Amino acid sequence: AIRKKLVIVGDGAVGKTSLLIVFSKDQFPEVYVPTVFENYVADIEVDGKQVELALWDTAGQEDYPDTDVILMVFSIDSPDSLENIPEKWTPEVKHFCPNVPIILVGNKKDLRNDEHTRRELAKMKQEPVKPEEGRDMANRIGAFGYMETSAKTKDGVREVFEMATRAALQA
Numbered sequence: 001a002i003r004k005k006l007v008i009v010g011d012g013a014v015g016k017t018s019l020l021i022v023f024s025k026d027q028f029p030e031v032y033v034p035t036v037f038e039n040y041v042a043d044i045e046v047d048g049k050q051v052e053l054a055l056w057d058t059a060g061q062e063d064y065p066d067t068d069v070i071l072m073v074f075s076i077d078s079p080d081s082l083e084n085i086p087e088k089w090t091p092e093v094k095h096f097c098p099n100v101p102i103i104l105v106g107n108k109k110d111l112r113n114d115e116h117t118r119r120e121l122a123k124m125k126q127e128p129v130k131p132e133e134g135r136d137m138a139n140r141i142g143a144f145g146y147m148e149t150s151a152k153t154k155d156g157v158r159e160v161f162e163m164a165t166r167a168a169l170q171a
């Protein structure tokens with residue numbers, strides 16, 4: 001139960017790299033945190049077990065070895081990114097990583113009540129994603145869990161990688 005492979009997917013600019021950075025910076029002893037994550041190994045202890053979590057980021061390859069857990073990310077400031085969860089990312093991962101557990105991640109939750117974000121979205125007849133919309137989507141796609149994060153304030157980040165690790169440990 002030591003080596004587990006995590007892949008993070010979702011629309012461009014939802015914060016996938018930022019989430020990996022925050023998680024990797026949280027490691028102690030401190031290590032150099034890169035800008036690219038491809039089989040990057042981070043150590044984590046969850047519950048009892050020490051785990052080597054190999055991180056794979058798909059930033060730059062959104063428009064195009066067996067994985068243990070998927071972080072599937074949308075952004076709270078982008079209802080478009082949430083709609084791509086059922087229409088694009090879930091079909092893709094279920095074709096290529098069937099039976100791999102999915103954690104649905106709503107990132108940028110620090111923008112839910114941000115006035116600038118709300119007015120830009122208003123010009124599109126859109127509003128920030130509501131928490132229950134995230135939970136419904138997670139239910140609809142059969143996700144192992146749903147979490148809201150902010151890579152900016154770091155809230156939720158540690159918890160989502162803990163949840164991802166438990167899912168990888170249970171298969």
Ligand SMILES: Nc1nc2c(ncn2[C@@H]2O[C@H](COP(=O)(O)OP(=O)(O)O)[C@@H](O)[C@H]2O)c(=O)[nH]1
Pocket residue numbers: 011012013014015016017018019059060107108109110111149150151152153
């Ligand atoms: N306000 C806010 N901005 C974020 C958050 N995560 C990422 N960002 C910003 O979103 C932009 C894209 O982030 P990035 O990690 O590169 O997204 P990626 O394309 O999915 O890998 C950056 O300029 C961030 O700094 C967040 O939780 N809150």
Ligand SMILES: *[C@@H]1[C@@H](C(=O)OCC=C)c2ccccc2S1(=O)=O
Pocket residue numbers: 007009056058065066067070092093094095096097
């Ligand atoms: C499954 C996973 C995969 O196929 O393993 C290969 C790792 C490079 C993967 C990889 C990249 C993007 C998506 C996915 S997946 O969740 O469909």
